[PDB]
């Protein structure tokens, strides 16, 4: 379970790890 390259987050409460680094509205 983690977001892939390019899903929103850093953005409002939103817990969801992404494989990636959380960025700009970005899972990257």
Known sequence: RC?????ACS???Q???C???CSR???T
């Open 3 to 7: 977001l892939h390259a390019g899903a």
């Open 11 to 13: 953005g409002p409460i």
């Open 15 to 17: 817990k969801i790890p």
């Open 19 to 21: 494989c990636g680094t």
């Open 25 to 27: 509205r970005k899972c």
